């Protein structure tokens, strides 16, 4: 075990402290560095496994060796010595730009920085498939792990004398969180009179028993056997938005849409939910047009009323009723209209704040006035 000299270090984040201590476990001892240095100055291949008997295997990658071995060396006997240097010099400078881009001052906090294997592609010679193979990284979860950027490297040693960087790379293991379901949501517009509206809900939500939370899909990959995320995708949802998803329609916000909205119908449980006041709904079998009542906002089409329906020039056959008939608008409590844009939010928030400021005197006199 080791102890961090926190009094001497002074200030450090949890990420820096953790990665600093993990550096003790992941760094080679000085004897390995001396043997590794001698091993490195014996190889001439782009990828080579160096096996120090009694210690774990080390993979060595040279980023311009293929070009030298495949292009420059065979050309030695028929090109001038000066052109060979110009051709290698072109590649070395291009390689340096990648090393500068990856390990330069843009790389903030080298100790706690994690670099994906794909970002290492150019430094490894342009492709990573051979490296993953020689690392033994394979299986049925490779695509889900790789596309979600799940293979991270970490710098453990930098050798200025012999010009090499040691990285620590790990192949992750996938584990399912029990009781967590990621739901994908989709919406359909509806009409109130001549105005077309759309309910504002998250694209993805997650549930765990009673609890509902937001879901961040940026680091996730949706595989057929489940979503695979390389970070924490779960993050809290505001209490008012949770009331929306729990059945309070007045808590859900709504927004106006453009004149060319393309989400005016959906197929759900073999039934068609369509804004027939905004698209042309016709019953194919009987040939009559399905009209949407002005006191209704949506149409729920099932086979009990129309076995086969045409919606936008597309003919659709629908199954048994899984959604009841549309109810009147007076039985649905609708939420507040909003605009989601950055400048629209600022203009409206500024108006609301100014209104609160102007009435500050009366709001800060409520207890007395209600007790008169």
């Amino acid at each position: 075990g080791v102890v961090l000299a926190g009094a001497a270090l002074g200030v450090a984040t949890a990420a820096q402290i953790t990665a600093g201590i993990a550096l003790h476990q992941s760094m080679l001892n000085s004897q390995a560095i001396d043997n590794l240095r001698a091993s490195l100055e014996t190889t001439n291949q782009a990828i080579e496994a160096i096996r120090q008997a009694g210690q774990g295997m080390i993979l060595a990658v040279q980023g311009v060796q293929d070009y030298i071995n495949n292009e420059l060396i065979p050309s030695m006997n028929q090109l001038s010595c000066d052109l060979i240097g110009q051709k290698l010099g072109l590649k070395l400078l291009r390689y340096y730009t990648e090393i500068l881009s990856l390990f330069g001052p843009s790389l903030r906090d080298p100790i706690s920085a994690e670099i994906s294997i794909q970002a290492l592609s150019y430094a490894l010679g342009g492709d990573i498939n051979k490296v993953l193979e020689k690392l033994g990284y394979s299986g049925g979860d490779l695509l889900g792990i790789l596309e979600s950027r799940g293979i991270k490297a970490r710098i453990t040693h930098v050798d200025t004398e012999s010009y090499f960087i040691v990285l620590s790379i790990a192949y992750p293991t996938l584990s399912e969180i029990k009781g967590v379901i990621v739901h994908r949501l989709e919406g359909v517009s509806y009409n109130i009179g001549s105005q077309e509206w759309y309910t504002t809900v998250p694209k993805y939500v997650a549930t765990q028993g009673y609890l509902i939370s937001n879901f961040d899909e940026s680091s996730c990959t949706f595989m057929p056997e489940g979503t695979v995320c390389s970070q924490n995708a779960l993050y809290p949802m505001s209490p008012l938005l949770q009331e929306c998803l729990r059945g309070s329609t007045k808590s859900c916000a709504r927004t106006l849409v453009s004149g060319s909205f393309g989400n005016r119908f959906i197929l759900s449980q073999g039934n068609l939910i369509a804004n027939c006041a905004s698209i042309l709904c016709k019953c194919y079998t009987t040939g009559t047009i399905i009209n949407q009542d002005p006191d209704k906002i949506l149409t729920y089409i099932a086979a009990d009323h129309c076995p086969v329906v045409e919606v936008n020039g597309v003919t659709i056959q629908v199954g048994s009723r899984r959604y009841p008939d549309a109810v009147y608008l007076h039985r649905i409590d609708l939420g507040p209209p909003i605009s989601l844009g950055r400048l629209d939010v600022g203009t409206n928030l500024g108006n609301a704040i100014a209104k609160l400021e102007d009435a500050k005197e009366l709001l800060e006199s409520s207890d007395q006035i209600l007790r008169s």
Binding site: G89, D159, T199
Partner: protein, 81 residues
């Protein structure tokens, strides 16, 4: 949980669900980036280009090595404390 009955009355439906998997890492391998190529068979035809390449590399490598040593000097055996 999610009240799908009221969500459909305002045109919101679920089109699919999936299980949630995260990542944990147990074993670690070492990958070393050998920055200096083997140029033995090029017969001294790239000396200037190699030296200029090394000069540019030093300007990137030294700040990172200094950062590693600064943290490593703060790691001490627990037996001493």
């Amino acid at each position: 949980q999610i009240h799908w009955g009221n969500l459909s009355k305002i045109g919101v439906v679920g089109i699919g669900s999936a299980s949630y998997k995260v990542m944990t890492r147990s074993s670690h391998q070492s990958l070393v980036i050998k920055l200096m190529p083997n140029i033995t068979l090029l017969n001294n035809c790239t000396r200037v280009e190699i030296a200029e390449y090394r000069r540019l590399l030093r300007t990137v490598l030294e700040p990172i090595r200094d950062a590693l040593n600064a943290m490593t000097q703060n790691i001490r055996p627990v037996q001493s404390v």
